[PDB]
Amino acid sequence: STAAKIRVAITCVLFIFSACFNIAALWTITYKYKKKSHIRILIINLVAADLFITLVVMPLDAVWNVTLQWYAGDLACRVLMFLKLAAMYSSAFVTVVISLDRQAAILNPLGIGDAKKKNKIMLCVAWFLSYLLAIPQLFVFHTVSRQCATVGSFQAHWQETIYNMFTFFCLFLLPLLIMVSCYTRILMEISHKNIPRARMRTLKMSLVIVLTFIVCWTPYYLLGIWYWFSPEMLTEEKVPPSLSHILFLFGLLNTCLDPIIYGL
């Protein structure tokens, strides 16, 4: 019960830091790119997704951490869980779009003039898809009778497992693969042809981005797959609640790290 009371405080301080960084980066983009550019559009879209995460996910985490039972009700759970998943999907898809845009700019430079249109469409798709893949949250989450959980919705354990694995693919695996593809393509193009310092910077940036992504989302999903393929780990209480409580915050850690990584 103590680690939960710690968690609420860490979540609150993450709220403060993330709001500060997001707002500061949004203001600073008006100076760094005072001339309007597609990079500004992508960065403000990422900051928008990150702020949506900051303003929905954290409140849910704190309130639920204190009030173990989801005192709002059933439809409240459905829509709020849908919003949480949509926000996280929006963050992931917007970072994927940023990576694709960087890849297109370096591999096909001549198309930069057409990058303001292309980026736009991509962003729209992303956002829509982030709210299209979030619909299942409404159905699969049912309020239960002594919080809110999916145990009352899925008929068989394998359906729950494949749903968790589907959100795994759409939230972590696919962004990681696209990031690695785009950045390794960039590195092999730049190394195929000033350029040395450039490529050193590129390697530093790509490695920090990929590994920060990895460390931020690997403990979270490690516990995730553990439970999804082996629920009994919780029935035997193999994992202490302190470990779970601390580890799940690594997901929100990316909320504060995204502005610093992509805004400098």
């Binding site: 009030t67 173990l68 919080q147 439970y227 799940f248």
Partner: peptide
Amino acid sequence: QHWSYGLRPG
């Protein structure tokens, strides 16, 4: 945890 690890409020 978008998932239901226990009911451990999430």
